Design a protein around this ligand. Structure first.
Ligand code: Y6J
Ligand code: Y6J
Lengths: 305, 304
């Protein structure tokens, strides 16, 4: 038993991280087969970032301006191109450690593991949810750009995130592995507002079920509610509306615990209206929303990879 | 910026995880050079676990009773011995993915990453602290035994923990890699009291520094205190005493923020005496004690 924010084992992704230097800037790249993917702002100087013309900046670059190093072995770049906001450097050698992999664009509220990297070397791994406003609350210092987020399915690494930038508010934004930003953000150093961030309601309910499975039951009650009625109070507290799709997703945790989904909503309704009254749930004094229902099932069932 | 609970990359350790079976039981083993390390209760039946005689049980076993699988490469066992609560299976093949490594016995309050494994396959990785009463609050299901905890410095894996059991309270206990339990626990299915647990004061202070580095300043006050005054309050609130060694280890964080250690103690004393008033620090409504000063320095500096 026990419940912890758990990241996927990072070994498959560690062997794909390289260092990409383009004169002034060094960040991280992903080496899959004979292509290195990295944020295209590697080609910007400091002052370029205010209003970069990326097509013009790319045209002034030659392959020899791209120093790619895997370990203390330099990779010979034989071409460069640009897919949306991701640079793609063609290299002379395919990565022998290339795992089976997919590129995937995740949805708000889904989670993934971040392998935080500096100078191409992995530094640590942690779990992250894509917020409803398409930001993530990670831990990223200068030079962390190009770090990637991923999920693992047995043997297949599904890459879903590449880190590009920290907003002035200190939250983080990036792209899928096709270079498309999550959310409305752009890769230029301008002030950019993230929309209103809401709480991932379906993830809070999944975590409450995690709590019951692990022995925390005090918040359970004997009250009913409809989906519509729960949503009327959820919006007051800046919770995402709960849909029938979410109820269906939570089905298996309902069955394992014998607590109907709408009964668990009635328990959350009372937690939002009356607070915790100084009590904790799974060692936390706040309602946690960065566990998906699949996250809980996996951690309380022990799936391996 | 930002501040997260962060595990070490697990790749070097993934390459050492193997599956160990002995008749009934299957659990995880750690394969370094030509030795596989695993909990000795792999040789128990469930009837055995109430009061196992490990000496006698081991005598009934031969090398060929031990099934060791690395992927599905089958390792041949050519020797076995018991060291404290750990079995050492000598195998005919050195692990070619053996990293540079050390065996280390950590101190209460220190942190480490856990690679939770089942049937020898990695499932997930997360960061844990060794509580002052020598339990850990992990996530372990049946079959996770033999999962290991470790820190990584540059290229060297320091193994500090192997998981053996869940106590009736739902907390977890285990050994160093020489088979010595942390705390008073023994590997039998009996009710066993862990001590009174306490909050790791030096870790809370390091985490308050992390908050100031990340912009949280509301808890900084105009008071100060002394080491002795603070420690009087620490004891009333079941916090570990604060020593000069702890002050020294906080020195680098004090230098970066310009907040002297005893001024941060005065902030914490105020938080303990008046509570947090429903406010948050770094996304938490509780005082967080599972970051060491080194954890904070490393995450706020980018060590790889
Ligand atoms: O490129 C260069 N500098 C250079 C400067 C700023 C940036 N920016 C703004 C920006 C605007 C659109 S995208 C990126 C970042 O947010 C980089 N970032 N990301 N995570 C960070 C966490 C902490 C600190 C910085 C972090 C990107 C690049 C040349 C070396 C001079
Ligand atoms: O009985 C067998 N194995 C076997 C069973 C139980 C156990 N025990 C008690 C015990 C007391 C001193 S040592 C071991 C554990 O706590 C194992 N544990 N650890 N983490 C767990 C998290 C959730 C559930 C169980 C967990 C240890 C070994 C043979 C295979 C049939």
């Amino acid at each position: 038993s026990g419940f912890r924010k758990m990241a996927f084992p990072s070994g498959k992704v560690e062997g794909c991280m390289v260092q990409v230097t383009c004169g002034t800037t060094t960040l991280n790249g992903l080496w899959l087969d004979d292509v290195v993917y990295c944020p295209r702002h590697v080609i910007c100087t400091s002052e370029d970032m205010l209003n970069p013309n990326y097509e013009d900046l790319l045209i002034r670059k030659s392959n020899h301006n791209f120093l790619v190093q895997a370990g203390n072995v330099q990779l010979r770049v034989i071409g460069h191109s640009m897919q949306n906001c991701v640079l793609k450097l063609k290299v002379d050698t395919a990565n022998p450690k290339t795992p089976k992999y997919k590129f995937v664009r995740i949805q708000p509220g889904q989670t993934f593991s971040v392998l935080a990297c500096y100078n191409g070397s992995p530094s640590g791994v942690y779990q992250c949810a894509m917020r409803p406003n398409f930001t993530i609350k990670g831990s990223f210092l200068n030079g962390s750009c190009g770090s990637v987020g991923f999920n693992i399915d047995y043997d297949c690494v599904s890459f879903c995130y590449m880190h590009h930038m920290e907003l002035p508010t200190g939250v983080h934004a990036g792209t899928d592995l096709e270079g498309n930003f999550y959310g409305p953000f752009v890769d230029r150093q301008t002030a950019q507002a993230a929309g209103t961030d809401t709480t991932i309601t379906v993830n809070v309910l999944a975590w409450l079920y995690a709590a019951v499975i692990n022995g925390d039951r005090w918040f359970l009650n004997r009250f009913t509610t409809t989906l519509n009625d729960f949503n009327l109070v959820a919006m007051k507290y800046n919770y995402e509306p709960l849909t029938q799709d979410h109820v269906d997703i939570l089905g298996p945790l309902s069955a394992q615990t014998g607590i109907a989904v709408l009964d668990m909503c009635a328990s959350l309704k009372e937690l939002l209206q009356n607070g915790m009254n100084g009590r904790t749930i799974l060692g936390s004094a706040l309602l946690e929303d960065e566990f998906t229902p699949f996250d809980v099932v996996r951690q309380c069932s022990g799936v391996t990879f």
